[PDB]
Amino acid sequence: ASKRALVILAKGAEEMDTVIPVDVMRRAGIKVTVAGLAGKDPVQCSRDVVICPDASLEDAKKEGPYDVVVLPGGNLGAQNLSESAAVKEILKEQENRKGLIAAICAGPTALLAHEIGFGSKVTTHPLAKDKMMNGGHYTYSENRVEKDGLILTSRGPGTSFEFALAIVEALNGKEVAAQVKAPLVLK
């Protein structure tokens, strides 16, 4: 049985925050669906890399549930995730079934928007801290990767390998994470 990941890709997403987890999860043997928030059409990311999703979110949501739901960052991408009723329902359903939710950089601010995981320790990009902390619903961390039960968060493009490997460890174990890590040539 392979584990399955849903990566929700919106216009303005940070392309590094998107691609590094997709690639590293696929190296781990996870079945990853890159789902376009707005449909199946190509998505223009924050630094103008254009990525073609595997499916629309409308279609991918009918194929779950997923062992992890991943929210990339990019301020405008996270804003789009935060405004979507479909994303709200996916995350609420994932939380209710005790499934992992992973978000990086500005991505965790969509958790706030959707009232997901309140009372958890979280990290974000430093510039997203004030947005995430509005109302005091989370406890903040400066760790590069933070995991408080089912809520897994991380800080930025430069923490995206660590983030992705933490997802891999959570789903497929420490040994698979270590095996996937070595050929990456990480610090």
List residues binding its own copies (CB under 8 A): 14-16, 19-20, 22-23, 26-27, 34, 42, 46-52, 54, 125-127, 144, 155-159, 161, 183-187
Within 10 angstroms of residue 125's Cβ, the number of other Cβ atoms is 25
Q: Based on CB atoms, which residue is closest to its own copies, 91 or 128? A: 128
Could you check whether the bond before residue 65 is cis, i.e. omega within 30 degrees of 0?
Answer: yes
Cα–Cα distance measured from residue 73 to residue 95, given in angstroms and rounded to the nearest whole number: 20
Q: Annotated catalytic, 105?
A: yes
| Active-site residue (options: 45, 52, 114, 125) | 125
Smallest distance from its own copies to CB 145, Å = 11
Cα–Cα distance measured from residue 78 to residue 91, given in angstroms and rounded to the nearest whole number: 14
Smallest distance from its own copies to CB 52, Å = 4
Cα–Cα distance measured from residue 66 to residue 43, given in angstroms and rounded to the nearest whole number: 22
Q: Based on CB atoms, which residue is closest to its own copies, 50 or 178? A: 50
Cα–Cα distance measured from residue 56 to residue 50, given in angstroms and rounded to the nearest whole number: 15
Q: Annotated catalytic, 137?
A: no
Q: Which residues are catalytic?
A: 105, 125
